[PDB]
Symmetry: C3
Subunit: 114 residues, 3 copies
């Protein structure tokens, strides 16, 4: 899995341990081993949500499988909860694009997962 | 909808009001209310387009529906016009990836849009 | 084609000529002219791979065609090779998302490639 968060919250507002917390929680939610989880947080961004520059986040979660209606609702509750608790971002100012990657379309370790 | 522009144009060259201008124009173009439009501008990037580093932009526009051949041509004229007028980027140095998201694959407010 | 590399390697560790090297190698690999190759490198990122903040990279390669099982394995060997040799990133700490864009979903020069 690959989880990317882009946010206008400043870097100093991202707590220490946040990437680890995301890695651990995504491993448990997706069922994937933690060694395959990649996380990326980009603060201090120039963005707006609904025309407003109040705290917001634009994110994406890609995975080879483990993407679907029920699973994605569960991931949204988890990830919006973490963004609210740790970055003080309201859940209604968060978008998460979920995408299911074919194993043949994911490069890793000089090859693909197909 | 979610619009992202990554550019090598410096931050000081992004005019005041640009995010609001993008939010308004994308609300009119997609027909979606401005409260549902998210915009993200990332200046000062290290990029090249066609092997050169004159001003350029790599962008994406995601929407739940409102994505198609004719609509995408209209969006390109609008967004290339805005990038040329406000950031002085030639339209032939702009790529925009359009993507149609399923509602069940977009997380927002602790759930999805399904 | 559009190639983006996001990495925690510092900016000073990106060699001069890297964008040109990626442009030429991707033009040769995809068979497309270098004039249509866009490259984007984002260093100094707050990211983890497998819970670790050792050097890593999260990348994507989009193209209108030239995406498939065998081609992607070849691209992965090429791009992991360049990231290892030029940025000192281990190939097992690199993910590359390959995506095949429809020409009508790629905006350029006030229209699309359809």
């Amino acid at each position: 899995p690959m989880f990317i968060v882009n946010t206008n919250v400043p870097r100093a507002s991202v707590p220490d341990g946040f990437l680890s917390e995301l890695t651990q929680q995504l491993a448990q939610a997706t069922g994937k081993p933690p060694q395959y989880i990649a996380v990326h947080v980009v603060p201090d961004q120039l963005m707006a949500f609904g025309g407003s520059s109040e705290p917001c986040a634009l994110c994406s979660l890609g995975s080879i499988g483990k993407i679907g209606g029920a699973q994605n609702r569960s991931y949204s509750k988890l990830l919006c909860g973490l963004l609210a608790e740790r970055l003080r971002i309201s859940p209604d100012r968060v978008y998460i694009n979920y995408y299911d990657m074919n194993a043949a379309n994911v490069g890793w370790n000089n090859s693909t997962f197909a």
